[PDB]
Design a protein around this ligand. Sequence first.
Ligand SMILES: [Ca+2]
Ligand SMILES: [Cl-]
Ligand SMILES: [Cl-]
Ligand SMILES: [Cl-]
Lengths: 295, 288
Amino acid sequence: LADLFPGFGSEWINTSSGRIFARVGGDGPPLLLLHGFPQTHVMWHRVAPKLAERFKVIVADLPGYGWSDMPESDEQHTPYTKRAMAKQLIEAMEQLGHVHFALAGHNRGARVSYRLALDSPGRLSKLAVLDILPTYEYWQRMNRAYALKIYHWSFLAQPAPLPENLLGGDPDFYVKAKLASWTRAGDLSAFDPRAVEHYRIAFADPMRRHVMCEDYRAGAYADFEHDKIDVEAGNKIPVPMLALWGASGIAAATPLDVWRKWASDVQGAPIESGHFLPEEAPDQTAEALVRFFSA
Amino acid sequence: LADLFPGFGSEWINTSSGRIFARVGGDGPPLLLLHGFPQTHVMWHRVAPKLAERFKVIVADLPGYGWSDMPESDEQHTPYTKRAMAKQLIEAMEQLGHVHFALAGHNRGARVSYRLALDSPGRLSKLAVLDILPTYEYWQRMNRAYALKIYHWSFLAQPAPLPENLLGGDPDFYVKAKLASWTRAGDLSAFDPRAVEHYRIAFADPMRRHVMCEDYRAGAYADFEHDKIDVEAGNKIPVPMLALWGATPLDVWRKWASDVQGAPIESGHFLPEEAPDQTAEALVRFFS
Ligand SMILES: [Ca+2]
Ligand SMILES: [Cl-]
Ligand SMILES: [Cl-]
Ligand SMILES: [Cl-]
């Protein structure tokens, strides 16, 4: 497996919940980057060099993903809830001496991020969320057309071992089809092939697949309940926020109008891209982030 | 593979779209019984005898299921639309000289059945549907709770080859899990193991699984649009109808049908296997 981060160090950070793997580079204000599904930390490899010119950049594998440890799950999927993930990443950042930091997330990693902002706003200087709406909003909008367009939220959330058994026959085919499907073009041309191999090797481990299923089960149950509490209470994130989305991404109204309901100081823009902003549109995504976190 | 229909013949019935396999038994007024997913005609083995006491009973594999031939599909999944399946079964019944008949269906076969009633009501003396609502109504209900409970409606409808690739790895586990998970008991104890083996064997064939996905693709697309035309027009089935359901559905069906009665049955989804005495008694009473 390639090293996609020239001159970044490598840390395995202890926490009460298990080790977090990270690459660490640059210097300046601390910025944590969180990937999602079906990826690992390496999906930031096109933008991290540019960010490292201005920030101390911490590129972490989510709890249970990549080279991070995999806690045993439970009947409420607790360790793979976004609440739990956020707590674990807070601990990992305190191990580095970072109690107040900037954060950018994509997909599951973005969900961790906004949940962190709702639970522990004082931890964050600023927050960016890439190509997502809140988990509550994804579920609320559910109807036939959404159910058919993006099916995997309900599929992976089926009780174990249904999705795990289905995914075990030909895992490579599933992971690669997902990666291609969510890009602008519908192919793998956006991705460095060495990055694709990181994703494929992760996905090839049944223990890593089970984590991804627990993640989505959390996404259907507890994470959705946690979000519902907030929206019904009228709680908004006070941390300055950026919402960046792909014009051909996954996230009627614009994602910016959705986020205004969840955040009292939010800006946003689309980028011409599928879901995978940092790989499909690296220059633009890096520029948007640098500008936001520096301003 | 066991013979679960004592005193029934076995016929291959010709149609413009391919052969329909059926077990045929009994004498008297004609009654067609249609299975659904992931089963075959054999799921009626517990109730067909009692019905054959009073009716000529035709137990048919749906187009593409079981031993019925598999018509070639197309980009709109046409031969696995309920409209097209109902046309095909009308032609099969004509080959027997039955142009006015009673019909009971379960799951996918219940959808063929209410579609046949909406399109060609003169074909039917009476109609029974088991443990379904109309396709349009499921889709209208498709919020977070329904997306979770009826996830397969979206998963099996994904474009080929996604569900076919996933189902090939361990088909036996998937078929057995669907069978179990929709019963009251949550296991396979309600089924005859011989019946289970018929279902497993059909499901083990990639071409048979492809047909199932084509059925669910029709279920998400054309079948939905056919139904939506009827609900937007205010069309109600005029045929005398019974809705049985596993323990309202009757209130739903009264919006779709002008002469409908209904009752719950103590059962999970698979009424004719989980609750064979109660289902047979209800069907015999209605169809008599
Ligand atoms: Ca330490
Ligand atoms: Cl989203
Ligand atoms: Cl770019
Ligand atoms: Cl059905």
